[model samples]
Target chain A: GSAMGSKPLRIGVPNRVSYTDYVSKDKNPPGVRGYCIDVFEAAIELLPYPVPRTYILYGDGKRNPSYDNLVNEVVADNFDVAVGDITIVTNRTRYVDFTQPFIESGLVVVAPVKEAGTIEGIDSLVTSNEPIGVQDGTFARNYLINELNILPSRIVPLKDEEQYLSALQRGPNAGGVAAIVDELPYIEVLLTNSNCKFRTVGQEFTRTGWGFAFQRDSPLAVDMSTAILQLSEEGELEKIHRKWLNYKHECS
Target chain B: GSAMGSKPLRIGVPNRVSYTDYVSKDKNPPGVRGYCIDVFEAAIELLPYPVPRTYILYGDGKRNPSYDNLVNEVVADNFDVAVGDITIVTNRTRYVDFTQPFIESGLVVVAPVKEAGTIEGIDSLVTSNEPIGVQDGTFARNYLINELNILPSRIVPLKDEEQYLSALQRGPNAGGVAAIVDELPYIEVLLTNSNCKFRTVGQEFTRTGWGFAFQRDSPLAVDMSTAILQLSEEGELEKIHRKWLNYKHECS
Candidate 1:
C-alpha cells in the first residue's frame, strides 16, 4: 500500500472509464483510476512535488461544468487542477492558466452528416445556426456557443454523449438539435449500436489545443509548465500524449 | 397638418392604438396612439415642454428599438425617450437607466402545458441535463440559459420562437427544453396561433417590474421618473397599464 498523503488533489475526469483502478488496478485499489488519472499518475511519478494529492471529479461534460463553469470552479478553488485533453483557449486566460500545449487535438464538430445535408465542410456550418448537442460542461461547447456567438440557448446541453447519439433520429422520432462535440475516433466505434444514426457534422468546426490546467496563480503551474516543456524537448511528452489522447503529440 | 410647435406630442406607437386615437379613428391621432407613448405625452403636457418633439420610431420588437435593443437608439441620440411596461433587470442597467415601477411587468417562464408529460415544472426539463430549446436572442431565451444556469450549449438556441415551438421534443426527439422569459400571455398568444403547437408550463418563475428605459445617464431618465410618479397618482397610469400589457401587468 503506497500511502503518499491523506488529502486527495481533486482532479476532474473525462467521465467514461469504468475501469476499477487506473494505476494499481487492484479491482479498485485505495487510489484513483480512469483514462486520465492513470496517465497523469504515471507521469507525476517521474517528477518532483510539492507533490499533488489526488481526487477525481468525474464530469459527463454534458450540461454541466459548462466551459465557463468548469474554469470558474478552478478560479473559485473548487479544484486544485484539471487534467486530460483540456483545450487551451484565449478566453480561458481570464480565470485559469494552462500548462502549455501538450496535445494539439484539432477541434472537430461532429453531427449526423446525412440529415445536415450538404454541410460537408466546416465553413458551411460555421454560421449555419443549427442546433448542436454538446456535453454539459466542455470547451468545444463553450467555443461554439460563446465564440461562435450562437446564442447559448441554441447549444443543446446534454448529460450523456452516448444517450444523445442513440436517441437521434430513430423511427418517427426526431430532435431539433444536431449533436456537435469533441471528435474522437472511439466515438464512432460506439455508434454501431445506435443504428449508425449519427455522424460528424461538417469538418471539425475549429482546431483546438489541449493542455494540463492549473490554478492561475498556483506555484504548481510554473513547475507543470516547465516539466511539460522539458518532456517535449526530451521526446517524452509526445509519448505521454499519444498514450492517452487519440491525437498526435508531435513536439516530442 | 397639425402644428409641431404646439398642437400635440407625436408619440411613437408600439404597433398598437389607444384612447384618443381610437376615438378620432385617424390612427389614434389628436394625441392618442401608443398606450405608454400616449400617457407619457400627456404627463409631459404639464412639464416645461407642453409640446415635446415626438418623432416616431417603429420596432418589430424583433428589430432595433425592440424591447432588448431600444437602449441603443436612445444613447445614439436617435430618440429623446422610450417607455414600456417591461421588466427592470440588472442587465438593462448596463445600456440604459430605468425608472421606478410605473407598470410592473416581471419576467415569466412558460412551457407548453401540453408538454406535461416531459416536464412537470422548471425541473421538468431545462434545468435537467437535457437540451431545452428557446428562441434565439429573446429575453425569455436569455433567462433560461442564464438565470437558471442552463448551459448555453445545453439550451437549444432556436433561430426563432417558431423554431422552438415547432421543433424540440423527446426521445430521438430528446429535443424539448424548459424556457424562462416575458409575459406568459404573449407566449399563450404564440401557443394559440394556428401554426403554433406548444403551451405554457404552469406558474411564473420570478417577479420583476418593468420601468421606462432611457440611455444610461440620459437626461430623459429624470423626466421619465417624474411622469411615472404623476401617472401613478392620477389613475391614468392604471388606464395605460390595463390597455396594452394588461395581462402581463397583472401576472406578476
Candidate 2:
C-alpha cells in the first residue's frame, strides 16, 4: 500500500454536531477531534502500513456547513479521504469511494410528553393529521409530507435540532407542532443531555449507515475497505462505535 | 446472510424524476427500471444466493413522494432495502445502512447563456449580490449561503427542479433569478432535452454521491458491498453510469 507516502493523506471532516463536534481552525491539531475520530484512528492502526493523515475541517465560521460540500472537497482533491458521520449513498460514490459503514443509524419520532388534550402514539398522531414539527431543508419534512401522506400545509419546518425539540416543548396548542421527527442518535443526545423535555415515542426508522469516502477507485480506498472488514471481524469496529455512539441496539 | 431468507426482501424505490422514473405496479419487474436501475439489478445478480426482492414504489398517483418515507419503509421493516437517486446524507444514514455510491454527481450554476447584462461566474454573482434560484427545502439553498457566503435575502427558493428551470426561464426582469444552481445530473437532462435556453456556466462545485440503503447492520449489506466493488472492477459500473446519465461536460 506504499503507492504514495510522500504527503500526509488529508481527511476532510465536516463540523456536524456530535459526529465531528467543533473544529478549530487556529491550530493544526494532531488529528480531527470529534466523536467519530476514534473510529478513524483505530481503523488506520489496523492498516498494513503507517500512512500519515491530517484533518481539514469543513467549517465556514457558521453552523453546520453543507456536508455535500465536504464530500466535494475530497472530490476536488482538497482531501484524500473524508470521514465522520459521512454517509455512503449512490450519489457520492460516483466521485469518491466509501469504506464499509462504521455506524448504523436511523430516524426516530421524538414527541412531547402527552399533555391534557393531546393524543399519543404514532398512529394517533398520524390519524389526527395535525401539524407536526420537523427540521427545515431536511428529508424528514419530505418524509412526513409525501410518505406519511400528511397534508403539506400541516408540516411545520423549524430552523434546526434546537428548534425541533423547542417547538415540541412549546406543545401544539401554542402555534407549535404536535410532534417532532428527527434522527434517533440526535434524539438520544437530546434525551440524554437535555432536561427531559423530549421522549422518543416511536422506534428508529431509516437505519442509514455512515462510512468514510475516498476518491473513486483509489488504491487507498481498497486498503481502508479491507481494513474495515478486519476491524468488523475483530470486533474493533464495535469498540470504536461504542466509544462514540455509546450504542445500545447491540451493534453488529 | 441466511438469517432472513424465508421472507421476501422488500425494496423501497422512490418515484423521483428520471431516478427511479416509474414503476409498474400491476407487474413485478425483475427489479426497478429507471435511470440507475442497472446498478441495482447487476449487484443483485452478483449475490451468492437468491434474494427475492419486492418492489414497493413510493408514488401513490400524486406528486413525487417523500424519499425519506421510502427509506422509512425499509427502516420500518416494510421494505428490506431502499434505492434510487437517494443521497447518502447524515439524516438518512441515522436509520438505514447504505452501499458504496453507485453514482457520483454534484451541483452547478445554469445561467441564461450568461446574457450580456447579467453577471458571469460565482464571484461576480456573489459580488453583485443578486437574487439566485434554488430548490426549496434542499441543501442547495444552504450551500449558497454557507459556502458562497451569498446573502440569504437575495436567495429565491422554488418548489422543484421543474420550477428551478422555469424560474430561470422566466427571466430576472419578471421575478426570475439571474442563474439557477442544482444537481448536475438533472441539469444535464434539462440541457440535453430542452432547447438552448440555458447552459452550465461553471464546473460542478458540490460532489454528492448516491447509494443503496438498507436496515442497519444487515448481512445483505456485506454481500452487496463486495458485489459493487466487483462491478466497479469489472467496469460494469461505468457502463451503467454511461447509460442513464448520457452525461457530457460541454452543453453550450
Candidate 3:
C-alpha cells in the first residue's frame, strides 16, 4: 500500500457496540459511520488527492476491544491506518504515528446523582476506600493506579459503558462501583442517555486529544493532520462535534 | 545525524531579539534559554535515553527570521530539529514532521486602549477599511488575507513586535495602524511590557499550538513528543508557562 498509490488504503475502525455512538458498523450500506468517521471523511475530502479506502472492523461485534491491540495492528502492518476514538498518548506514539488530535478531551468522574455530593472530585477517590470503575486498558485506569496512587484492589475494570453504568447503579457492595472515571465525551453521552441519573464531579484531569493512527513514518499521517487543522479553522470540526455529542436531555 | 546515534543532534533555534521573552541566546554559557527552551530541556529529561545535542541559532542575531525557512532547514537536513515558537500549521507538514503541540494558542487582536471601543471583534476588522498590522510571513498575516478576506492593501506587514508597537501608536492616518494581529503569547508580552497602553480586543482566532519540527521520518520526533506528553501530565509544562508568562503589570 505504501508503494502502490492507486491501492485503496485499509482503514481499521473499532467495532464496539458500546461505543457505536462514536464509531460503529453501518448496516444500510454495510459501512462504518459515526462522529469519528464523519470527522475522518471530512478531513479526507480536504486533501488534494482522493484517498481510496475500505473500513475493516477491529473488535468483536459484541464487546469492546483493546485499543492498545488495535494500535499494535497498525504497527504490525495489518492495517494501513487506525481511525476512531484513539487517544494520542505518549506510549502509543512510541509504536505508531498519530496525527494532531481532532478533538481536545480530558478525564472526568461520574457518580450517581444521589452519591454525587459525597464525592468531591478526583482527590476524593484517592482518599476513600470505595471501589471506582474505569474502562480496561484506558489511560483512565492508568491514571488511577499511577498518578493518583490508588490501590489496585479498589479499581474495578469494566469492559464497556453498559457494564460501568450497571456497576454504578448497584453500589460498591453489590458488584457496583462508587464512581466511574472516563473521558469527557463518553461521560457526556452517558449522562444524557441515562436521563441525568449520573452527574459529573470534579474538574477534568489529564488533558489529551483523539487522533488517527498510522504505521510508523506513514505519509498519510502528515497529510491527514494538515487537513484536521484546516477543518478546525473552517469550524467543521465543531459542527461535527455538535451533531453527535450535543444532546439536550429532558432531565429537568 | 540520522544514522550516527552517538553524534549530537543539531537543534536549530530561532534567533529573534524581539521575541527574547520566549527564546534567546544565553551569552554566559553560549546556549539557548527561555520558555520554549526550558520546556524543550524539561521534556528531554523525561526521555529514557540521553539525547546528545547542540543548539545552533537560525537568522541574524538582531532580526526576526522566517519560521517557514527554519522548517525548510530541517527538511533540507541542515538541522536535525527546529525548535521554538513554530506553529503547527497545515502547509509546513508537507516538508517536515511536527510533534503534538506543547502549548495551545490562537491569534488575537491588539489595539490601543482609546480606539479599542470602536473595535468589537474580528468582524470589525473585516468590515472596516482601516489598515491593520501583522508580522510578515506569519499565520496572523495569512489569516487576515485568507480567512477574513481582508484586502492585502489594508494589511501592514511589520518585522517585529517593536515595529508593530510603533505602528499602533502612530494611528492609521499618520503612519500608524488601527490594530495589530498576532498570537496570544506575543500579545501578552506586548501588553505587559507596554504598561496597558494596548488591550487585546476580539476573541482569539485560528486556534493552534506550538510544536517542535523534525526532518521527515526522523526517529527523534516521536521520542520528543512522548516526552512532551509526559511533561504535560506531570504539570511541568504549566509550571514552565507560569514561570515565564505570569508577570503582573502596574496599571489602574
Candidate 4:
C-alpha cells in the first residue's frame, strides 16, 4: 500500500519470516511494525530533501522470496530503495549502494542439541556427506560456496530460518539437516523459543553489516547516509538498536 | 623494551604466539612486526598526551600465557594498558575498557580432508568420540567448553595453531585430533601453507573483534579511542590492516 504521494519514495520490504522480528508487513500478525521501518521513518524525516514513499511488501507473505529478487525491484526502479535486515555484501553493493550500516551483524550456525553432538561447526556440516541448510539467496548461502569452498551439491536451499530450524529439530529422524546458517539475532530469537532444545555452534561468522539498499549512486543514498551518520553520532541509532535487538553499547 | 619515560604507559603485550602474526614482541623477525603494534604505535603518536611508554612483553617470548592474566596486569598496576589481538568479549569488558575493534575476524573449524568426511560440523566433532584440539587458554578453548557445551574430556588443549594444525595433519593413523578451532586469518594462512591438505569447514563462527584493553574507566581510553578514530578516518588504519593481514576490503 502506497503512503505519501507526489514522488513518494517506494521502499521494498522483504516479507521473509527470517526477519519477522525486524520487519512486519501488512496484517501478518502485529501489522506494520519493526526496527527497520522505525529507522527508515526517522532517517527520512531528517533528510535535507523530502522523500515521498510507500511500503511494497514483497511476495505478499504467502511464501518467502529471494532477497535478490526483492532488491532487484530497487534496481529495476520498482522501488526507490529497499529496507529490511538486508545485509550489505560485495555483490549486492555492485547492484545498489547502501547507507552506512544501521546495525553490526553477522551469520551464525544453529543446530538441535541432540544433533549438535555429531556436528562440530559449519565446516563439519559442509564437509560431511549430510546436507547443510541455508536461506535462499543469502550471504550465508553465498559465503559457504565462495569463501568456504563448499560445493553446491553439499548445500541445501530452504525458504527461511524457520524451515531450517524445524529441519534441525527433526534431526536424523526426518532427513534433517546437520545445521542451519543464519544471522546472529535471529538465531538468538530461535533459541529463546526452542526451550533449550537448540544451541548455537561456533562463533559469529562474518561482520558483513546490515544496511538499507538504494539504486547504485542514487542521490537519496548520500542524504540518507548523512542522516544515519548524524543519528548514530547523536546516539539515536543506539536507542533504536536497543529497542529492537536489545543491544547494549558498553563503549558509550 | 621501555621506549619512553615520565608517567610512562605500561603497555601489556600478551605474548601469546598464536597471535604472533598480529602481535610481535622481541626484536621483530621483520623488525618490530605485527598489525597491533603498527596500529598502537601510530595511534599512540596521535594521542594528545605523548604516551611515555614501555612494552613489557608478557611471558617474554619464552612461553605462552593466558589473555585474562595479561589484562589483569593492567588492573594490578603492573601495566597501564594491554595490547595484542585481544578480543572484545563481554566478561573481559567488565574488568577493562576496549577501544573500537581495529580488526574484524571470527572463529573457524579446520580438520583433515580424509577424516572430515564423517564430521558434519562442530556438533559432529563434539559427538564423534574423537578429541577436538584448541589453543590453551584462548577464547576458542573457553568458548568450545562453555558456550558450545562440549565437555572438557572431549576438548584437547594445545600450545598454538601450529601444534593443532600439525595434529590434524597426522590424521587418525597417528592418533591426530578430529578438529581444531582457530581464527580465520590464521586458518587461511595455515591452509595456504598446507598445500590443500586442510580445509575450512563452514564459515567463520564469530566476529569477535580485536581491540586494545585498558583499566575500566581509564582516562587514557578516550584519547586512545579518539586516536583510533582519527586513524580510521584518515585511511591510515586500512593501510595497516592491508599490510599485516592483507585485508581486502571487498565490501566497500
Candidate 5:
C-alpha cells in the first residue's frame, strides 16, 4: 500500500554469500531468507491497504559502503525501508529513525583458524605486533582504524570475504593482518566442516541489535515499525527466523 | 507530523560538523553546528502527520561504527531513517536503503608540510616504510594491513590531530605516519593553522557520496527522496556544499 506516494521501496540485501564473502558466505542475507525481511514483509501484508509497491534487492557490489552513505540515503530519502542484518548505535540515531531491534550481535575480531588455535582478538595479534585483517566498512576495520588510530587509509576488501579469511589464515605473523568479522551463526557450518582458525574477544564491546530504519521523518517508517511490533506479538517472527538461519554458527 | 502512530520519528544525523566553543579552550565536537541538525529537522517538516514520537540522534566520535549495528538498525525497524554525513555504498545497501547521494568525497593522505613534499601517496612513503600513523578501523589502516600489507601496523590513529601535526612540524618524521583519512572528511578543523601537510591521491579510488537511508518497505522513503531531489534542484545542496567546503583544505 502506498502510504503517501508512488515510490516503490527497493530493499537492498547482501547478494554474495560465499565462504570468502562478507556476511558469512554460508548464509543468505538476514532478511532475504531470514526473519528480518520475512517478518517485515509479513507485517506489510496485514496493512489495511495493499502496499503501493514492494522491492527485495541487493547492494550491487560496492562491498561495504561508507558508513556515512548508509545513513545519508535515508536522510536524503531513497528507498522506503531496507531489510538486512545491520547494527544499531547512538551515533546513527542522530541521522535516521530506527525501530526496536530484531537480532542481537556485536563486532568481533576473527583471525585465521590457524591463528585461532591460541589468540582471542586483534590485540593478541597486535600485542605480539602481529598484523590482522578486516574488511572495509566493518567495525573490526574501524577498531583497527579509529580505535587503533593506524594511519595509511587501508581496509582491504580483496575481491570478497574469503580472501580476507584467507589473508587471516596465515599464521600469527600471517602475510599481513588478521580478519575480524561479526561472530555469525553460520561460522559453525563453515568452521565445523573446515580447518579455519578463528576466535573472538571473550567480551563484546556492545550487544548490538538488528533493526529497520527510515528517513529522518518519513511516514512510512511508522507503518513499518507498527507492522514489525505487530508481527513480533503475533508470533510470526519465529517462523521467518528459522527459515533463514538453518545453518547457524556458534557466535561468541 | 505524526504518521502511523504518535511516536516521534527518530532521525539519525551524522555528527560530523563541530560547534565551536565561543570562549573556552575547547569547542563542541567539530561541526556539530545547527546546520547539520537543521537538515534533519527540515526533512521532518516534510513528512505527513503525528510527527516523530521521539527524537533519535546518533553522534560518531570517529568515522566508523559496528557495520552490523549500523545496518541492522535500518532493516529491523529500530530506526526509520539515517541522516548526517553517513556514507552510502553497495555492500551496505544489501541491508538498508539509501537516498540520493548528497556529498561526494573519499580518502585523503595528510602529513606535515616537510614530509608532504617528499613523498606522494603510498608510492613514496611505502618506500621508506618508516612507521606511518593510521586510524585503525579506517580505510587507511585497512590498506596498510591489506594492501601495502604492513607488518607492524604503522597506520595507527594519532591521539590528537593537532598534537600529531605539531609533533610532525618539529620532528624529521614528524611523529606522523602520513595521516590518511576519508577524503573531504572532517579534519583540517582539527588541525587548523597547525604545521601539517595534507595531500590525496587527488583521485579517490572510490567516488562515494553521503545519503540518508531507511529500512526496506518504509513508505516514507519516497517523500524523503523527493525532498532530496528538491534540494538538489533548488541548489540548496550546493549552498550547503559551499558552507562545508568554504575554504576547501587538503585535509577536509
Candidate 6:
C-alpha cells in the first residue's frame, strides 16, 4: 500500500512569471513545462509503482511566487509535493523535508557590463553606497540582510525579472540598482536573454543545491530522493540539463 | 516542546572493529570516537535544544555488521537513530530516511603496486579471470554484481578491512583477489596505513555520499538535516574533515 493512500498527489509548481526557463504554463496544451518539470516526469518514470499526480500553480500569474509560502502550503496540506528551483536551505528544512539535491547551485552577482569594471565581488556592494537588486522572499534577499549584514535600505526587493532587469538598466543613480544577486541558474538565463550586456562578478558563494520539498514526515520524500539518485546515476538529469540549460553566449 | 519528548534518544553506532578511521570505540575512557562520531556530536551541538542521548554499539565487535540490518533495527524500534558511515542508497531508503549527505563520496579500485601496471579501470576486472575483493554488505559489492554483471564466482565478499586486506596481499594466484573495491574514505585510510604498496586505479565511479539514518517519517530528520546544512555553510564540516580525513599519503 502507498503511504499516500491512493490519493492523487497534489504537485505544486512555482508560477514564476519572469523565469519560464525553470517552470512555465503552456497555453496551447494547457500544461506545465520546463527543466524542473522534465526532471520530475523522468523520475516518476523510474518509480516501482505508478504515482498519480496533478500539477497546480503556486503563485498568481503576474508576479514571482514566494517559495517560502509555497513550502508552507505543503505543510498546510494544500500540496503533496512542491517542485521547481527551490533551494535547499536550513530555515526551510525546519518546516519541511527535501529530497536529496537534484542539481548543485550557489549564489552569484550579476552586474551590467557597462559598469562592470567597478564591481569585483560581494565586497563591492558591502563597501560602496550603491543599491543592489534581489528577489523578494528569496535566499538572496535574506543572505544580503543576514549573512552579509547589508542595510535593508540598500537592498531593492523586486517581484520578478522584469523589475530587476529594468532596475539594472536604470543604474543606481537613476532609481535602480548597481548590480543583482541571485542563484546561478536564474542569472544564466537573465544574461542569455539580455544579449550579453550583463556579466557575473566574483566566484559563487554559499554552496547549495536545488531540491523538491514535501510535508514534514512525508513518506514520499525518501522514494522521490531514491528516484532522483537513480536518475542522476543514469545521466537522465544531465540530459535534461543540456536540453534546457544549454544557453548560448558565455555569461562569464 | 521537543518532538522526541523527555525520553533520551537511543543512537546506534556501527562496531566496525577492522576499521577505526570512521567509527571506533576508545578504551582509555570507554567512549566512542572517530570522524563520524565527531560530526554527529557537532551537529547535535547546533540543535536548538539539548537532546539527551546514549551511544550503543550495533555489532558484536568481531566483524563488520550488515548496514541493511542496522537500518532495519531503526525501523523495528531498536534504535531511534543510526549514525555512522552509512551510504545513502535507494534500497536502504525503502525502509528508512536519511539526512542530507554530510560527506561527498564515491567508489574506487585499489590494487597492489606489484601489479599496478596491469590494472587500469573497472574494465580490467571485467576482462580478467582473476577474482576481485569487495566488502560484504556494501554498495561496492552490489555495483559489481548488479551494475557490472560480474559473475559471483569471480567476486570475493569479505566481512571487513582485515578480510579484504589479507585477501589483497594473498594475490588472486595465491587464494586472494586481484584488486579491492571500496568507498573513497575507507580506501584513503587503507592507503595511508599500507606504506605505498597499493595505488588507486582509474577515476571514481558511482557518485554518492554518507548520511545518518532515522526511522520512516521521523521528525528528527528535518532538524538534523538543518543542523548539517548550517554546519556546512559555516565551514564546521570542513574543519571536522581536516581534523580527521586529512590523510598524509598521496596514493593515486
- TM-score of the A chain in candidate 5? 0.71
Report the lDDT of model 4 for residue B112: 75
User: lDDT tens string, model 6, A105-194?
Assistant: 778988888786787777786787799998766777777787787898898888777787899999989999998989888887788777
TM-score of 6: 0.77
Q: Each candidate: RMSD to true structure?
A: 23.6, 26.1, 4.2, 16.9, 20.4, 5.5
Q: All candidates' TM-scores? A: 0.40, 0.47, 0.85, 0.51, 0.42, 0.77
The positional error of residue A250 in candidate 5, measured at the CA in angstroms, is 13
Tell me the tens digit of each residue's lDDT in model 2 across A86-192.
75544465567677566555566777655413545555677877778765334455556655667888888675556766677777778787777766656665565
Estimate, for each residue in A58-154, the C-alpha lDDT of model 3 and write its tens digit: 8877666778889989988899989999988777888889999897778898888798678868888677679999876566676678778888889
Off by over 4 Å in 4: A1-252, B1-5, B28-32, B160-162, B246-252
Q: Which stretch of 10 consecutive residues in model 1 chain A shows the poorest summed lDDT? A: A17-26
Residues B113-189 of candidate 2 have per-residue lDDT tens digits of: 74524656666677766678865434566667766788898898775557767778786777888887767766777
Off by over 4 Å in 2: A1-252, B1-5, B18-31, B116-164, B247-252
For model 6 chain B, where is the 10-residue window of minimal lDDT?
A: B24-33
lDDT of 4 by residue, A135-220 (tens): 76566766777766777776777766567667787664477777777778667666765567677787665555677888865657
Best-first order by TM-score: 3, 6, 4, 2, 5, 1
lDDT of 1 by residue, B87-198 (tens): 4554554455554444433344455546567665565555446666544334655665655666777655444444545554432145555542445434544444424334
**Candidate that beats the other on TM-score, 4 or 5, i.e. the better one:** 4
Worst 10 residues of 4 chain B by lDDT: B243-252
Cα deviation in Å at residue A144, candidate 1? 2.3
Kindly report which residue stretches of model 3 are placed more than 4 angstroms away from their true locations once superposed.
A1-7, A48-50, A111-118, A157-178, A190-203, A247-252, B1-7, B110-118, B157-178, B188-203, B247-252
DockQ of each: 0.01, 0.02, 0.59, 0.02, 0.01, 0.47
Report the number of clashing residue pairs per model. 38, 25, 0, 30, 176, 0
Q: Which stretches of candidate 5 lie over 4 Å from their true place?
A: A1-5, A14-35, A56-58, A62-68, A112-118, A122-126, A136-140, A148-155, A158-161, A172-176, A183-196, A248-252, B1-252
